[PDB]
XYZ file of C-alpha atoms in Angstrom:
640
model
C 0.000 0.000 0.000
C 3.096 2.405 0.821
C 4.559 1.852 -1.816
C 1.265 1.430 -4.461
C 0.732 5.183 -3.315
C 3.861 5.991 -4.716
C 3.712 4.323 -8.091
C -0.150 6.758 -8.325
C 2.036 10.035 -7.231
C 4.862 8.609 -9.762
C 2.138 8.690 -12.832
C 0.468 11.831 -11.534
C 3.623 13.416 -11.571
C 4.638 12.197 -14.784
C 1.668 13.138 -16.681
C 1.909 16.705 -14.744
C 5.287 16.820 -16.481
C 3.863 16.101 -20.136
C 1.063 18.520 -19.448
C 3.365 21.354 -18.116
C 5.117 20.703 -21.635
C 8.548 19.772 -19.397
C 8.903 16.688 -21.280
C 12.527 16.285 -20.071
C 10.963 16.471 -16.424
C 8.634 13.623 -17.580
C 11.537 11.954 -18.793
C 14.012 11.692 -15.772
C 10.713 9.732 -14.024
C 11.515 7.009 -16.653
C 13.623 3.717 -15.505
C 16.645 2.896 -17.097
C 16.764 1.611 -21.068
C 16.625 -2.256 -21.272
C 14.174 -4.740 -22.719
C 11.621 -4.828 -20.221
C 11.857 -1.586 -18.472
C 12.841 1.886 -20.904
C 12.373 1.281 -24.469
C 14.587 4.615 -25.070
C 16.580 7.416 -23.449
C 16.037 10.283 -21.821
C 16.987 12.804 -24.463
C 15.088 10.219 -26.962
C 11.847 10.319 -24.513
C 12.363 14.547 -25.264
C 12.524 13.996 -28.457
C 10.095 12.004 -29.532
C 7.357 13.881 -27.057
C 8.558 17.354 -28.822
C 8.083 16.263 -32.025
C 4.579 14.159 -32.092
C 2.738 16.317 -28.934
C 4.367 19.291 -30.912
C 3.053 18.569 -34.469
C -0.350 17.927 -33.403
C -0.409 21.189 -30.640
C -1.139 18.985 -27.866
C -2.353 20.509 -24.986
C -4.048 20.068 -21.741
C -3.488 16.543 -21.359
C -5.901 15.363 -18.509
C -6.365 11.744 -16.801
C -8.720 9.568 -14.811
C -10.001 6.447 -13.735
C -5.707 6.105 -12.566
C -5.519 1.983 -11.407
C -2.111 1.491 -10.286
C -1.333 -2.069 -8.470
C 1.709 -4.720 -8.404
C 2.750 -7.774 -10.515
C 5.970 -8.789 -8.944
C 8.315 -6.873 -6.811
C 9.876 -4.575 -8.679
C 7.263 -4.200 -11.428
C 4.084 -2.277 -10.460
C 1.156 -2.019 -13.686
C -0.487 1.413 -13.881
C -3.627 2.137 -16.183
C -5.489 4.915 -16.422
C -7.694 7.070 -19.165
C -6.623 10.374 -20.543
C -7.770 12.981 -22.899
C -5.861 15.933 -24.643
C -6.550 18.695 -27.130
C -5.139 18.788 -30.526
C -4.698 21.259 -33.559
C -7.460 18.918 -34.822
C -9.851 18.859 -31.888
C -9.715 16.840 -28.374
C -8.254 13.094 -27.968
C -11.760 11.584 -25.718
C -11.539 7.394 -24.393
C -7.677 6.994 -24.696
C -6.915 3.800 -22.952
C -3.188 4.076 -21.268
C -1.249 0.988 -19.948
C 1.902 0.945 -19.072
C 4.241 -0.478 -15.792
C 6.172 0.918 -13.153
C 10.124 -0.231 -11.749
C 10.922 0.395 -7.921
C 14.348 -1.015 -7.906
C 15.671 1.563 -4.771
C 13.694 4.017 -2.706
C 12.027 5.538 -6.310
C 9.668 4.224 -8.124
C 10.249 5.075 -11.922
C 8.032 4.470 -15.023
C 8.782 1.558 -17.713
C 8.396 4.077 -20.630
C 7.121 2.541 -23.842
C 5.895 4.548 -26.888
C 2.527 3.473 -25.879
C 2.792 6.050 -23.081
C 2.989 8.507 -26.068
C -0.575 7.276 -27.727
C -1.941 4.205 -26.708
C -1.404 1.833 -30.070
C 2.255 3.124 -30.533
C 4.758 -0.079 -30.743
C 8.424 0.696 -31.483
C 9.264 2.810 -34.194
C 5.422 4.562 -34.932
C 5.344 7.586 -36.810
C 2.773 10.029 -36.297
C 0.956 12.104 -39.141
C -1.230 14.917 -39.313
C -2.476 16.633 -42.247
C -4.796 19.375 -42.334
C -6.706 21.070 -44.530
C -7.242 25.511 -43.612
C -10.545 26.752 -42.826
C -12.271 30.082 -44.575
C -13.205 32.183 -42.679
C -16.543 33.495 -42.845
C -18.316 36.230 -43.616
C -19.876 39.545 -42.016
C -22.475 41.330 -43.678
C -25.351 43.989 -43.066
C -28.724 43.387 -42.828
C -29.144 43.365 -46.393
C -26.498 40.808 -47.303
C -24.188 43.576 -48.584
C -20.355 42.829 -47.339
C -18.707 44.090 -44.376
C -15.690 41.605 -44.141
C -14.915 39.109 -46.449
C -12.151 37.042 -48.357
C -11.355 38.179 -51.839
C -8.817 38.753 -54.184
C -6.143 41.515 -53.732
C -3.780 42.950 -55.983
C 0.037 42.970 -54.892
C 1.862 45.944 -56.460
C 6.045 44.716 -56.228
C 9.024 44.984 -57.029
C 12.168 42.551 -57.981
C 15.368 43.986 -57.811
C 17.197 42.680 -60.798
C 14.532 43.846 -63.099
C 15.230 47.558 -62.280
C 18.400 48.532 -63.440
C 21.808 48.604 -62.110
C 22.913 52.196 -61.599
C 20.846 55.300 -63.145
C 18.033 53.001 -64.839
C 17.381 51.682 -61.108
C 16.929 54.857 -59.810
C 14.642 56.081 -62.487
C 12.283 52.748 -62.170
C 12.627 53.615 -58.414
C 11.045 56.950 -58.754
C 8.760 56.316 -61.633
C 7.123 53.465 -59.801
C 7.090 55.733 -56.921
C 5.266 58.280 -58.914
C 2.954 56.292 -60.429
C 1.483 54.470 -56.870
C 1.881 57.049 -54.648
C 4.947 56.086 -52.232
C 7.779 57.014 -50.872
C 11.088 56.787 -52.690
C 12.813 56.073 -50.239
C 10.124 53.628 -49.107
C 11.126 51.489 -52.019
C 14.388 51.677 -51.309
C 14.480 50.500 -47.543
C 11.929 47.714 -48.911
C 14.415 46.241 -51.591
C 17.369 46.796 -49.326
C 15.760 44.797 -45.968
C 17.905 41.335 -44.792
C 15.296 38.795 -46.251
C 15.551 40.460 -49.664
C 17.754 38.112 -52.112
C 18.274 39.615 -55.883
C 15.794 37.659 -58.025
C 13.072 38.287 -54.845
C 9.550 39.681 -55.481
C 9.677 42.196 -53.030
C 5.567 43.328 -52.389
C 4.795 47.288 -51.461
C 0.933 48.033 -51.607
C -2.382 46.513 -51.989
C -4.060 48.444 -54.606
C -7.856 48.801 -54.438
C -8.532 50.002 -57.966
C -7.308 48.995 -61.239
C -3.856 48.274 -62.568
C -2.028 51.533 -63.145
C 1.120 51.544 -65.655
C 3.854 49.198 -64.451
C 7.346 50.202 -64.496
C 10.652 47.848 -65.442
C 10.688 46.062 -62.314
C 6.734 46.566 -60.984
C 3.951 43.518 -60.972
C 1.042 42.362 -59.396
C 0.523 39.078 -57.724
C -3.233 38.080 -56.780
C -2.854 37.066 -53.376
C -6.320 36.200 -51.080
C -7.017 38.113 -47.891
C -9.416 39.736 -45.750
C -10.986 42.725 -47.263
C -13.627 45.538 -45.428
C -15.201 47.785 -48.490
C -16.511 50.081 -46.029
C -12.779 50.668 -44.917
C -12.267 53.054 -41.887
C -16.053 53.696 -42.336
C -16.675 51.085 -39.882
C -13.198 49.679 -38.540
C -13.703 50.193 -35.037
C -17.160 48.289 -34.965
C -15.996 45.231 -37.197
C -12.155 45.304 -36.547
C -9.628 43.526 -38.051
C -7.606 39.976 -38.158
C -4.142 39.402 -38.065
C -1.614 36.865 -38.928
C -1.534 33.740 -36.239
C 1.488 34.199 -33.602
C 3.137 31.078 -31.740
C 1.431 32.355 -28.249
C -2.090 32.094 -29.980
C -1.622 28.677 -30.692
C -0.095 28.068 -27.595
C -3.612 29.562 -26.207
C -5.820 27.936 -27.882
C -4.525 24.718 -30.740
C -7.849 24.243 -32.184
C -6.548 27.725 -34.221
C -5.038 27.457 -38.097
C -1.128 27.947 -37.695
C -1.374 29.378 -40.793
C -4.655 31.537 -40.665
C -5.593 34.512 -39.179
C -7.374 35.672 -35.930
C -9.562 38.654 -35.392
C -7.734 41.050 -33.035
C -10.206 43.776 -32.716
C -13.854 44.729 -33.024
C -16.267 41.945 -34.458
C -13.662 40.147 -35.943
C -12.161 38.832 -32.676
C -15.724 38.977 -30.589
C -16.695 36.514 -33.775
C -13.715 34.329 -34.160
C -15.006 30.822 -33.126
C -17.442 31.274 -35.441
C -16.178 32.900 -37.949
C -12.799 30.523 -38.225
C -14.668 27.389 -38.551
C -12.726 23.816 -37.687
C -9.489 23.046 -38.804
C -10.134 19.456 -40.840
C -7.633 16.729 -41.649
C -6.683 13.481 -40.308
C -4.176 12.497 -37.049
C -3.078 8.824 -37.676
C -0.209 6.458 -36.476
C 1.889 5.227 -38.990
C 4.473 2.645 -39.009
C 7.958 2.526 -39.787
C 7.214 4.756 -43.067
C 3.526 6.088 -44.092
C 1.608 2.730 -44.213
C -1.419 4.065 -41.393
C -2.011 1.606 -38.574
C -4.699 3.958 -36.448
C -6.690 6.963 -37.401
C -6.800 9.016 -33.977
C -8.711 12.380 -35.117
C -10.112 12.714 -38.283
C -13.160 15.005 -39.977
C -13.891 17.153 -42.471
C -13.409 20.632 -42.940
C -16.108 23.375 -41.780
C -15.725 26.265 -43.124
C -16.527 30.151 -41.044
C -20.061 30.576 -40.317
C -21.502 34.056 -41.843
C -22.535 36.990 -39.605
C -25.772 38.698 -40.519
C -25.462 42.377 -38.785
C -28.358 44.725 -38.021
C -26.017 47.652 -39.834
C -27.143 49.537 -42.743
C -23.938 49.893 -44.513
C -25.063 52.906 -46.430
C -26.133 54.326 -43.459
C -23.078 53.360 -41.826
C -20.709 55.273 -44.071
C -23.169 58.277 -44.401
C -22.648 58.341 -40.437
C -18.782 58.320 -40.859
C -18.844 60.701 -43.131
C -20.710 63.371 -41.755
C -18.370 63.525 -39.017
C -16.028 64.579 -41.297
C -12.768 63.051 -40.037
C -13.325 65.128 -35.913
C -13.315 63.203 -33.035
C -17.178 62.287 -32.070
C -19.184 58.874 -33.006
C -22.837 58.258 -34.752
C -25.610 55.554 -33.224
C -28.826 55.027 -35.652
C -31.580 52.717 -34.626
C -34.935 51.822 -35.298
C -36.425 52.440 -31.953
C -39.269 49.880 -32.007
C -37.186 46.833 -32.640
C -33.581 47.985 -31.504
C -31.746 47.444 -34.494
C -28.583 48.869 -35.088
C -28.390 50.772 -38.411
C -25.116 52.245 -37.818
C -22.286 52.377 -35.202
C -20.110 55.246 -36.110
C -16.866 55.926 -34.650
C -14.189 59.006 -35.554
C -11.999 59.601 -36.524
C -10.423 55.623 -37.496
C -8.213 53.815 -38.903
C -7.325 51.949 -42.105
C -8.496 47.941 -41.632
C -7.224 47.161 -45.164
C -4.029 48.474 -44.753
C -4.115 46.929 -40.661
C -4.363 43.403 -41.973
C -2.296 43.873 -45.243
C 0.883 45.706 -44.900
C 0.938 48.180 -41.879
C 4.624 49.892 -41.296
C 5.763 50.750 -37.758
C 5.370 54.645 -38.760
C 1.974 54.751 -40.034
C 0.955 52.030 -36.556
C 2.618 55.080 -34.378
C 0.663 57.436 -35.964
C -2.350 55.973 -35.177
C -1.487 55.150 -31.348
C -0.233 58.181 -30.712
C -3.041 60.712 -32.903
C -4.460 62.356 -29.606
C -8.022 62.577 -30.822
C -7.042 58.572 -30.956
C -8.540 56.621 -33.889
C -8.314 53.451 -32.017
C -11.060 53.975 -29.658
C -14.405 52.274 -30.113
C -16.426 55.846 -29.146
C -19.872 54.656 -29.680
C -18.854 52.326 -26.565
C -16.787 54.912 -24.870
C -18.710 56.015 -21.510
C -19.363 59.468 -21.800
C -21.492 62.249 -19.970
C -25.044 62.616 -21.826
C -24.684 66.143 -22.145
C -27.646 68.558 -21.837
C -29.811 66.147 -23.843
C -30.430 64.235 -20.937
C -32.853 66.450 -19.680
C -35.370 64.945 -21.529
C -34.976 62.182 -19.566
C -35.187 64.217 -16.135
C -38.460 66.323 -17.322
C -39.910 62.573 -18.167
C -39.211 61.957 -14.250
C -40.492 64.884 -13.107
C -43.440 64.673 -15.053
C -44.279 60.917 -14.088
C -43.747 62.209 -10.237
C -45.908 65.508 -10.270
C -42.508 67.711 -9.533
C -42.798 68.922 -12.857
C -45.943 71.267 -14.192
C -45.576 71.425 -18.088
C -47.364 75.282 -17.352
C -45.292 76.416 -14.466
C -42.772 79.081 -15.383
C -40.044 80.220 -13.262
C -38.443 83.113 -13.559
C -35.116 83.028 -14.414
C -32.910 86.398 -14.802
C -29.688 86.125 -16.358
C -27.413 83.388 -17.433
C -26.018 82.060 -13.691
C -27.478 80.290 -11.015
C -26.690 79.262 -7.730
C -29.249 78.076 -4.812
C -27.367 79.284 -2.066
C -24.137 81.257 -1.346
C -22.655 77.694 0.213
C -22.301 76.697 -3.655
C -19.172 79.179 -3.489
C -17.992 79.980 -7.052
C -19.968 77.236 -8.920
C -23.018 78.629 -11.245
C -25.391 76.656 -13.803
C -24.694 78.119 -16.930
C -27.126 78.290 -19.760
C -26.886 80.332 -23.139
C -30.417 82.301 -23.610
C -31.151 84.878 -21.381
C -34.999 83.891 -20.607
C -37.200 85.257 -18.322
C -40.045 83.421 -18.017
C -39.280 79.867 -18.610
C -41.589 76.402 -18.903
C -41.147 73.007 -19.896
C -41.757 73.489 -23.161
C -39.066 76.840 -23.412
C -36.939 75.117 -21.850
C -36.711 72.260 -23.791
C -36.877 74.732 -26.739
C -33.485 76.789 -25.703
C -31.720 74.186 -23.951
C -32.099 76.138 -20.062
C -29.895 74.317 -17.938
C -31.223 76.309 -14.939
C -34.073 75.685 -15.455
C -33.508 71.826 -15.299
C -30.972 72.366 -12.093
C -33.588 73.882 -10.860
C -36.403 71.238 -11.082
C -34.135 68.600 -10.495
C -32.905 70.216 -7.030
C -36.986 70.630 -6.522
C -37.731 66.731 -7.084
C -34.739 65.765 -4.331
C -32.237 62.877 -4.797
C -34.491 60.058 -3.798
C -37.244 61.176 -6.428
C -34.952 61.310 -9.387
C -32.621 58.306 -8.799
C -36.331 56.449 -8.256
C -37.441 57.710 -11.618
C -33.484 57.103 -13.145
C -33.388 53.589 -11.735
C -36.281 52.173 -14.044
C -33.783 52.893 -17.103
C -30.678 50.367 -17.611
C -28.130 51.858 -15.449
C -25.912 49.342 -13.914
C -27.111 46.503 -16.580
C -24.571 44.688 -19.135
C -26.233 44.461 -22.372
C -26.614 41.510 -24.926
C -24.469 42.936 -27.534
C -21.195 41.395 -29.219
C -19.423 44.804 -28.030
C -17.034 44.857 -25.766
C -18.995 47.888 -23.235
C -18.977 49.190 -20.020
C -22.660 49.487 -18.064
C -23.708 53.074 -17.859
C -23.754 54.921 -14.036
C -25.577 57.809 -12.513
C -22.613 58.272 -10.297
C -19.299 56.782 -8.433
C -21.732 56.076 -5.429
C -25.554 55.111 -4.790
C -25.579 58.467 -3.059
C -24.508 62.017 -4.569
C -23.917 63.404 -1.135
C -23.620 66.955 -2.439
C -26.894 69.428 -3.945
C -24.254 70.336 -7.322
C -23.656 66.877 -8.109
C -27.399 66.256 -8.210
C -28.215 69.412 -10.034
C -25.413 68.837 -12.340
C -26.748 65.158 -12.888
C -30.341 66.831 -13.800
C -28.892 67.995 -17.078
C -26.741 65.616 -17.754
C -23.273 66.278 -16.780
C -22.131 65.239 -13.143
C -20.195 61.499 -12.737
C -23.195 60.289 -15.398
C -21.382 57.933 -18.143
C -23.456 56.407 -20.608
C -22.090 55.570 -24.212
C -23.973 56.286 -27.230
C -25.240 52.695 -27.712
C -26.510 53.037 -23.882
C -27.756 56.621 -24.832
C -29.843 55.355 -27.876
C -31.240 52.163 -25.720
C -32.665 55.157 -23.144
C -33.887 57.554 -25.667
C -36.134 55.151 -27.385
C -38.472 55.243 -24.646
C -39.722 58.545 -26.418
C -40.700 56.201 -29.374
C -42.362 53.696 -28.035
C -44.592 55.394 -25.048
C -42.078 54.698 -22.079
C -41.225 51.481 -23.084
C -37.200 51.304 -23.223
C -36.289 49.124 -26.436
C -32.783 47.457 -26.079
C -30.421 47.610 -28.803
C -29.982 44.536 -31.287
C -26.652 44.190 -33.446
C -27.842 40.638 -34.573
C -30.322 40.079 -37.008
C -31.705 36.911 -36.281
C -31.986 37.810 -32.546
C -35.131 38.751 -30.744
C -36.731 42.564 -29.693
C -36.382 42.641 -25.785
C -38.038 45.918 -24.235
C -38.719 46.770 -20.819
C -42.115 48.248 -20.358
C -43.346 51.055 -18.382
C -40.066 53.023 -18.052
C -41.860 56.763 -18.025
C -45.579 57.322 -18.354
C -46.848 57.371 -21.146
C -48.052 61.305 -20.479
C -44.655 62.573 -19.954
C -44.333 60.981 -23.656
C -47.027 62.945 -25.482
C -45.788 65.760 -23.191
C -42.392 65.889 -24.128
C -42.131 64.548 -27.791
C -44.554 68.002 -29.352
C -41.969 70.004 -27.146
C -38.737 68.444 -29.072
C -40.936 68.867 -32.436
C -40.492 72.486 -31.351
C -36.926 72.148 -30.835
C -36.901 72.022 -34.637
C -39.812 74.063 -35.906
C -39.296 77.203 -33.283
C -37.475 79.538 -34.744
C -35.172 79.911 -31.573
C -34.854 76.309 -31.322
C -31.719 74.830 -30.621
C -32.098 72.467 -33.895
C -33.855 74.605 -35.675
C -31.420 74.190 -38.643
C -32.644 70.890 -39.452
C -36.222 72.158 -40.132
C -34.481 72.668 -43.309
C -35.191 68.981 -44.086
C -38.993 69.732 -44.281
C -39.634 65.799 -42.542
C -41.144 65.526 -38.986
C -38.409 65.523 -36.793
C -38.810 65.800 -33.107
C -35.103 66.280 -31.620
C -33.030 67.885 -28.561
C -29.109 69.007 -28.575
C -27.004 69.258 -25.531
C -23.595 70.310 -24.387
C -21.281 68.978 -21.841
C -18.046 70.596 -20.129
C -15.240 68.752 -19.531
C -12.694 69.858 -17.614
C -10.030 67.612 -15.565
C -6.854 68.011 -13.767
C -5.242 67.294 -16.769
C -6.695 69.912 -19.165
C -5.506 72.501 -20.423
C -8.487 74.900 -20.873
C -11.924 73.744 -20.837
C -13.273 70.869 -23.608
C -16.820 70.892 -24.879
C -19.098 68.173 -26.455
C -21.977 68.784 -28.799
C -25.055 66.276 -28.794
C -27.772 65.534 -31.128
C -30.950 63.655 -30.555
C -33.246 63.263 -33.472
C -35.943 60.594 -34.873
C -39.410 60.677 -36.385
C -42.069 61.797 -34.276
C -44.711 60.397 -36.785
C -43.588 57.220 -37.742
C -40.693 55.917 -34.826
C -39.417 54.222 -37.864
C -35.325 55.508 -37.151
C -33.418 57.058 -33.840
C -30.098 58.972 -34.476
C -27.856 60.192 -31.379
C -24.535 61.963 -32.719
C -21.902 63.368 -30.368
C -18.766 65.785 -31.171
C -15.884 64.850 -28.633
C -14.087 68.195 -28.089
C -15.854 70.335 -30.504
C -14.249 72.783 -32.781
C -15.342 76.642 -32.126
C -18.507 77.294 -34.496
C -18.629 73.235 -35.025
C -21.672 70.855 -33.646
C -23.370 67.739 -33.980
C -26.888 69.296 -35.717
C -24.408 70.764 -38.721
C -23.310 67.315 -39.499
C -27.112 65.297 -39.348
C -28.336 67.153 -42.329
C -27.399 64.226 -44.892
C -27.942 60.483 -42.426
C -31.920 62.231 -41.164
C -32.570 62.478 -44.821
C -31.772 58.362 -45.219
C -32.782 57.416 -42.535
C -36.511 59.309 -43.197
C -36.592 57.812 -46.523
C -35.518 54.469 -46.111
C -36.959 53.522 -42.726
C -40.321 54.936 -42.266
């Protein structure tokens, strides 16, 4: 029994070894090499465990049902079952034998290849083919593409072709010329270690067609990832990259030859957009004659991904911001979808998976306005929009009279002299302001004001039906939205500031759209969809339905009043009830103060679309309503 225990602890550390990938620790618990103990040596035990578990990735080799007892008294029989992952898939129902050797005070295992897989005898090869996956497909919701695998053309060079001295650099700068590009890119390409004379040395994907070749220039179809939309939508689908060692290391069900998404949709979508490597993992025997067929199944190529993106609307979005820093949702507030998830400014996804140089990767990590970032799931402050969601509370808890008007003189506002310096600020100098004016000019006092009037526990009642503090079903890698650091504000400016939207509030635009469709639906909160297929979940009974028909004619009035805040985009001549907002940011850390613009639009007649549009530090004279002009127009004729 003594010393059964410590033939068990013997295998169990052995098999720790091979799972730890110390195969030479594995292999210094093997007995000596003779005929009925070792069939090889320690350095061969390596060996051969580097090479086969190595081919086939193995990893996370796991045992049970261990059975370890005696058949004389040195020799001690150990069995037990085992399973391990491969590049293939997982090893299930391996049946291990083997024997153990206590000849002093250490027992020591009687290493056979059969300890390697169980069928092995002597001198077994092992073979693996495999066969690459495609990776699937993303599209929008009307099939168009959004990442796919097509054909791309190679411009190169080969650096006998060109010329020797004169003629060389001539080719150089005419095929420099002619493809936009350095010259003295072209140079430091043909001139890299790798290069060898008669090498085709590859520059830049071209997108369009073939333009004049130079002595020395072709193209080479070569298949890779492609996204038409480009930096239109790079943050939202992302890219893929080429396969590293430490991925496969991670996870050996991965091509070590493919690609993996590293970013966006791409990587949130991998399993099922890689599909299952195929192929076959067989013994062999002394040369390729199979004896046993371990793993073996066909190849299944990427599933497709059917998005709820319009990818018209998508680039319109893009493109109305116009290269600033600021981000674009557009829904269809009854059912959630997604129609576009716009982040600026970006970065170039063709030119990330192709051929990206260490300069032009800089440039976009260290652009301050920062491309990288996904800003339509960025937490941000609502911005003075939000007080459509605070006059919905005050109107569902009778703090608010749509009729009441205070009277408000000048542009500062404190409630008592204990505030010290700190002042709502608000842009129109109103006197007597309601609801309805207020919702009209954007007062921030006047929401400060009701907000301080409903009290703390009132308005985080009324803000705790919404979706703060909830993690929503969506492929995007998000933060929940907060009404502050704490469950209590624990100071009358943080809870006036909070009234219109600005305090330690951070909700990202995808939040922002999922709250704002409660004005579409009657106070029932829709929650965003991204996937087609998936279902419409909703939350009912959010605000009354009276602070609804109370508030939506006021935000039609936002547009149609000539001293509305969005009264630019009456322009349009469509039904548009919307709101604007600003927020002020200003940290430790900044310089001066920052400003955001909002927008908040959709159709008040049919609910058929929902746009929110924000401008991260705004330009003087710039804002989110100037940009909205050319995705409310789509949006009102193609989603009614």
């Amino acid at each position: 029994t003594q010393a059964v225990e410590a033939g068990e602890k013997t295998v169990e550390q052995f098999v720790q070894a091979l799972n730890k990938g110390d195969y030479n620790k594995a292999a210094e618990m093997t007995s000596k090499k003779a005929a009925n103990k070792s069939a090889l040596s320690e350095k061969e035990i390596l060996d051969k465990y580097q090479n086969i578990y190595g081919a086939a990735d193995v990893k996370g080799l796991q045992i049970s049902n261990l059975k370890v007892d005696k058949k004389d008294d040195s020799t001690y029989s150990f069995s037990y079952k085992a399973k391990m992952n491969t590049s293939l898939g997982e090893l299930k129902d391996l049946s291990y034998k083997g024997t153990l050797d206590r000849n002093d005070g250490q027992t020591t295992i009687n290493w056979q290849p059969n300890l390697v897989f169980p069928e092995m005898e002597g001198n077994d090869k092992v073979s693996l083919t495999t066969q690459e996956a495609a990776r699937g497909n993303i599209i929008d919701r009307n099939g168009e593409p959004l990442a796919t695998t097509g054909k791309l053309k190679q411009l190169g060079v080969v650096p006998s072709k060109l010329g020797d001295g004169g003629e060389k650099t001539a080719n150089i700068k005419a095929i420099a010329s002619s493809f936009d590009l350095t010259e003295d890119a072209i140079n430091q390409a043909i001139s890299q270690s790798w290069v060898q004379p008669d090498y085709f040395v590859p520059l830049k994907i071209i997108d369009g067609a073939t333009p004049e070749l130079p002595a020395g220039a072709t193209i080479q179809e070569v298949d890779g990832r492609y996204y038409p939309l480009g930096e239109a939508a790079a943050q939202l689908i992302g890219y893929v990259g080429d396969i590293t060692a430490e991925d496969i290391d991670k996870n050996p069900e991965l091509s070590s030859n493919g690609k993996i998404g590293r970013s966006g949709l791409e990587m949130a979508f991998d399993k099922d957009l890689r599909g299952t490597t195929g192929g076959k993992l067989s013994i062999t025997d002394a040369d390729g004659v199979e004896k046993k067929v371990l793993i073996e199944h066909e190849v299944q190529n990427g599933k497709d991904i059917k998005l709820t993106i319009d990818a018209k609307a998508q680039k319109t979005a893009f493109d109305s911001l116009g290269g600033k820093a600021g981000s674009t949702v557009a829904t269809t507030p009854k059912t959630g979808d997604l129609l576009a998830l716009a982040s600026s400014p970006s970065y170039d996804p063709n030119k990330m998976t192709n051929g990206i140089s260490q300069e032009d990767y800089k440039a976009y990590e260290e652009n301050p306005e920062q491309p990288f970032i996904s800003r339509f799931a960025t937490g941000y402050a609502p911005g003075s929009t939000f007080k459509m969601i605070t006059a919905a509370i005050g109107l569902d808890n009778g703090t608010i009279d749509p009729n009441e008007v205070l009277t408000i003189n000048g542009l500062k506002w404190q409630k008592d002299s204990s505030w010290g310096s700190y002042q709502v600020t608000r842009v129109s100098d109103v006197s007597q302001v309601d609801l309805k004016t207020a919702l009209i000019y954007s007062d921030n006092i006047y929401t400060a004001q009701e907000t301080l009037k409903m009290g703390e526990k009132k308005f985080r009642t009324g803000l705790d039906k919404f979706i703060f503090g909830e993690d929503l079903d969506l492929p995007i890698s998000m933060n929940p939205a907060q009404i502050s650091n704490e469950d209590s504000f624990n100071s009358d400016i943080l809870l006036a500031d909070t009234g219109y939207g600005q305090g330690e509030l951070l909700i990202n635009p995808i939040q922002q759209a999922a709250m704002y469709s409660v004005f579409a639906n009657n106070g029932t909160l829709v929650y965003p969809k991204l996937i087609a297929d998936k279902e419409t979940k909703d939350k009912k009974n959010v605000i009354g339905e009276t602070a609804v028909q109370t508030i939506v004619p006021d935000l039609r009035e936002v547009v149609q009043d000539v001293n509305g805040t969005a009264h630019s985009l009456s322009a349009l001549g469509i039904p548009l009830a919307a709101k604007t907002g600003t927020a002020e940011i200003k940290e430790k850390q900044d310089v001066k103060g920052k400003e955001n613009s909002f927008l908040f639009a959709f159709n008040p007649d049919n609910q058929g679309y929902m746009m929110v549009s924000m401008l991260e530090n705004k330009e003087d004279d710039d804002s989110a309503t100037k940009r909205a002009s050319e995705l409310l127009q789509y949006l009102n004729q193609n989603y009614q």
